[PDB]
Amino acid sequence: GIPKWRKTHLTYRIVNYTPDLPKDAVDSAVEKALKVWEEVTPLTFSRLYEGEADIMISFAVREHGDFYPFDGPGNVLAHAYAPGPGINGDAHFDDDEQWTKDTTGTNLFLVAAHEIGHSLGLFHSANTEALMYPLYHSLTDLTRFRLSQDDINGIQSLYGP
Template identity: 55%
Template sequence: MQLAVLCAVCLLPGSLALPLPPEAGGMSEPQWEQVQSYLKIFYPYDSKTRDANSLRAKLKEMQKFFHLPITGILNSDIIKIIQKPRCGVPDVAEYSLFPNRPKWTSKVVTYRIITYTRDLPRFKVNQLVEKAFAMWSKEIPLQFKKIKTGIADIMIGFARGAHGDGSPFDGPGNILAHAFSPAPRLGGDAHFDEDERWTDGTSIGINFLFAVTHELGHSLGLGHSPDPKAVMYPTYEDRDAKDFKLSQDDIEGIQDLYGKRRD
């Protein structure tokens, strides 16, 4: 009889669920699981750090990056941030794709658009990519040359789900795009999630110019900026397209890598 009662209790849903840790801040279990996944992707553990496996330490790191009160405890401000669409590149400076300040050594960097989105005409995608490159080249002594065939330094394309680089897209929302720092093969390449609705700013959707300018910053060697006004800020913000330009933080970052343009 006692064994039967015990078995019945064990089968009750949630009866043996472990309480959430203090770092959860009283949030729900789905929210806590969501933030753990977010931290794993965008604030990966550094084995050299003493408390590398501490979620509290990772929460503090995220709070510091986004200029939030550093408590190490989950709150509604963090929930709002993780629910925003964003770039798929991690925020931490120790990210493995950006060791030793990689940059292009050639003064002429080639690029090629290998796949297009169905949301925009090809000529419009070409125009916006060219405009994004022009924003960066205005500040540094690099020239960008488009090629139509062969392997370019920076390969640009749209894809869905798994697309051969080990970083699959996740469907509409959340991760919009990602890019790799200067290097052979995948290095410099920029990929955009075709499951998003892409726009040139004349309709509802993700403004492709904003996204491609950001990703090309990664393609040139920049990491994420904690400055909300910067193009290299990790989350997507819908801005006024007429006023869209590199911030002083973006300019100082890219010139720190390549120097100033001298016409």
Template identity: 50%
Template sequence: MWSSLLIFVLCLPCCLSFPVIPKTIRDDLEFFKNYFHRFFFTKEESQYQTLEDQLRFLQHFFRLEETGWLDEPTKAIIRQPRCGVRDVADYSFFPGKPKIRNNPITYSIINYPRGMNHRTVEKILRKAAEVWSSVTPLKFRRVYKQHSDIEFAFLAGDHGDAYPFDGEGNTLAHAFAPVPNYQGAIHFDRDEEWSYYDEGVNLFVVAVHEIGHALGLGHSQDSDSIMFPNYQYQDPKFFRLSDDDIIGIQSLY
């Protein structure tokens, strides 16, 4: 189907002429391929999938109409700011269903974002953790030493974990499953404009999502779920976990 869009042969008396693919289309396709290989399947994993297959897979995940085309709804959703963790489906877990075995769970704050009061950041992160303790037996306790079950850090660019940040917009944060090496590490892109309101990026909303990963939850297809991969502002005063989130976390704890 892509041949009709991308390759059109015009017969002339003495030659074959191939029109140049518009740069905007090339850029959109390149962006999609990079996105798909970063968040769904690598080039090696998807080498036997056609571009149409990849588009339909992504559209199915995001519950879009499965056109197999890089249409406007698809372009819009892959351009939205999001979490840097790869996608799966429904409420989901990491392979082997790892979880934090300690209770209370300890957390530490390695550094702070620019432009936010430290006490405000501490309050936000505490409230984000309490969202998960409100529906499980888990308790959270802040510690002031480097090693803890969960570590919050604000980092920029290439910061040594093979998942570099890309500046303002796009990838906002990422977190690691509760397994050895990077257990419980939660990294926020320091170049974002973090806030407690609807200006910039709401730290509370992103922190709740990333704590979910640190506890063992993967991404969800449910757009009402805090574990949906794309960022969606919600007023912290009225925030509630979805049924999908509650079922998922209670399946682990």
């Protein structure tokens, strides 16, 4: 049990969207990803807009010159930060892509969950069922989507025993 600067309560801010799909896709994805950890660990969060909350989820169009420019439908889709004094819980989403909620392309729900897990203080895992797996698995089985012992231990080290 050792979370972000020992803080149990983290605030998140939505500063991203999707040009392809509706706003339910992006807003609910961030919250479902944010709360997917809430449904697994006793973490506390709040969604606001002030200026900059703990976790800041922003969009990144082709002018993405902070790490990698737009790649279109490439294998890369997002990047996030966690153990930092400033970049604490901050991520970016490739705007130039087909963000979808049904796995029809760039699953923004799975990606957000994976990005949120990163921002919370976790890196990559090894199990194929793990939400923190280094590969976006085209798993059409959204009825079997869940957290696994692999990523579970990762978030457990953060907010658990």
